[PDB]
Design a protein around this ligand. Structure first.
Ligand code: MYR
Ligand code: MYR
Ligand code: FE
Ligand code: MN
Ligand code: MN
Lengths: 309, 310
């Protein structure tokens, strides 16, 4: 079924290309889960109330279940790239998939360190919107790539995975861990965990930005494809946040505000249009070798850290 | 399409399971391609004959094409595990796949560091047996898993990928690099590269052993499946080595002996049979949590180093 090898081509691999830059950067930024000290977090964990632990278990459950979902649901995109003959994108997606496995590993290591061994499916039960995104929308949109690796489907898939799950919901998730851990000077492991995954997640967001950009740049009809999926998904994501808060009667532990999160989340969502729009008109041959989507993600992380202080 | 999350299960993930054990140690044994010093290599590379550089370029072309092939052809196996619902296997295979991309990366780094920018396809022209393994058997057998994730097909895929490509063809290639570099005290980059990817390869073969083992333990018909595939592939694998030597008149550069490599390859090939057969009769529940496929791969690698002192 194979007739040729990308790595045997003239000039070889293009080290300037966006997906290879991200790949090189993931190698330089690699971290070990065994290096995270978890030996302090159980002491903190027990000094919390029955209600504080309920929220934190429910957030961790949404995380690890979401981490697992992405480790699985990225394979079709890898398959699409193999089919499309894009070796650089393909190689990066291996690192992508591996990174998601490592996040799934490390959240499981935290649950074990705080001594949670019971079945956790019940924490997603009161969250019908969570399951709509992670058991339904994420895999169905991504698996559609196996039948239809069309530019339109790749955008719809990227929007769903990269821009909403990672770009909007995960960042919102991290903000929740900031409010829980940093403000109350607790759970140093979870903090180091959230830092380290946050780091990996930035190359992921960069990649989603790259993918949507190159498609928009080549055929401007795809902008509308991007727009529409974003518009379907934002209300669903906001809904997830509301349900999490409504469970605690809008007045939750850790002094968390419903409207604070809704404003914080929307900001992460809308900011995605800006990432993609500047590709309209630009030539594809520049989008390939353009590092900016990774830069944008650095300055986004920068702006986020500034906002906290 | 998803109804449950494996990581939310009671007891969580089984850290004792073989695929998670390899993942853990993959993390610990992670290496950076940017740590490998390639500077010294172009100095040695230019002090070689034309006949020497040809063989070395032909071996590297076969390697870097082989690495790329495995990076592509393993995605179906991931899909199979996703379908069979085996999370520990999935997780490991993501690291597996990533490793292959990093080997592809690092061979290309080498080719750059020595000054090779020409199209390298012309080096697989005279190797029809290479193109049969890597452009036909490997993808066609592995892509079969997307339509048919059955035990039989998984055994057939693992035999192709892990037991022959990795277990027999890759180790023979490493041996070639040993006889080329270590013996002639040249190419310290290629050397560091070869032992570093070798470290990864051992976990890949360990997984290959685990996969075939758990299928044979559960159904003894899968032994015959294993046996049949191995018997198909071995001849083709020796063919590859014979074609590669016959290009240099059986008398190639670096003083490489054809019969030496056939006997060396054969040994790597046959040892695979013994790796899987001891699972016959054994309980499947034991194999899931048994680390010996990774131990065996360590004692094999140790046995190989020892052989070299001769
Ligand atoms: C009320 C708190 C809202 C927090 C949202 C739930 C957290 C979901 C985690 C998102 C999954 C991350 C996937 C990834 O690693 O890219
Ligand atoms: C002339 C001697 C023949 C040398 C054997 C060709 C090289 C084997 C292909 C490399 C396969 C690598 C697969 C892997 O890294 O898992
Ligand atoms: Fe390998
Ligand atoms: Mn992640
Ligand atoms: Mn390899």
């Amino acid at each position: 079924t194979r007739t040729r090898s990308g790595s045997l081509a003239a000039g070889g691999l293009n080290w300037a290309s966006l997906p290879l830059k991200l790949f090189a950067g993931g190698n330089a930024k690699f971290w070990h889960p065994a290096d995270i000290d978890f030996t302090r977090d159980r002491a903190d964990w027990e000094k919390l109330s029955d209600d504080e632990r309920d929220y934190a278990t429910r957030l961790c459950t949404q995380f690890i279940a979401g981490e697992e979902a992405v480790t699985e649901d990225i394979q079709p995109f890898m398959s699409a790239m193999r089919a499309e003959g894009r070796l650089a994108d393909e190689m990066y997606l291996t690192q992508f998939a591996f990174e998601e496995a490592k996040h799934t590993q490390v959240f499981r290591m935290w649950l074990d360190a705080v001594g949670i061994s019971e079945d956790l499916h019940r924490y997603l039960d009161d969250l019908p919107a969570y399951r709509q995104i992670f058991y339904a929308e994420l895999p169905e949109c991504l698996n559609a790539l196996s039948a239809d690796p069309s530019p339109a489907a790749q955008v719809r898939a990227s929007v769903t995975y990269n821009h909403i799950v990672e770009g909007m919901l995960a960042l919102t998730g991290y903000y929740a861990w900031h409010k829980i851990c940093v403000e109350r000077a607790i759970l140093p492991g979870m903090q180091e965990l959230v830092r380290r995954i946050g780091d990996d997640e930035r190359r992921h967001m960069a990649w989603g930005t790259f993918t949507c950009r190159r498609h928009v740049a080549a055929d401007d009809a795809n902008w509308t494809v991007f727009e529409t999926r974003m518009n379907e998904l934002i209300p669903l994501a906001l809904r997830l946040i509301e349900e999490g808060f409504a469970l605690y009667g809008d007045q939750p532990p850790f002094d968390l505000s419903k409207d604070d999160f809704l404003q914080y989340s929307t900001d992460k969502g809308m900011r995605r249009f800006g990432t993609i729009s500047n590709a309209r008109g630009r030539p594809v041959a520049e989008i390939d070798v353009d590092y900016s989507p990774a830069q944008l993600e650095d300055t986004f992380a920068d702006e986020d850290r500034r906002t906290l202080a």
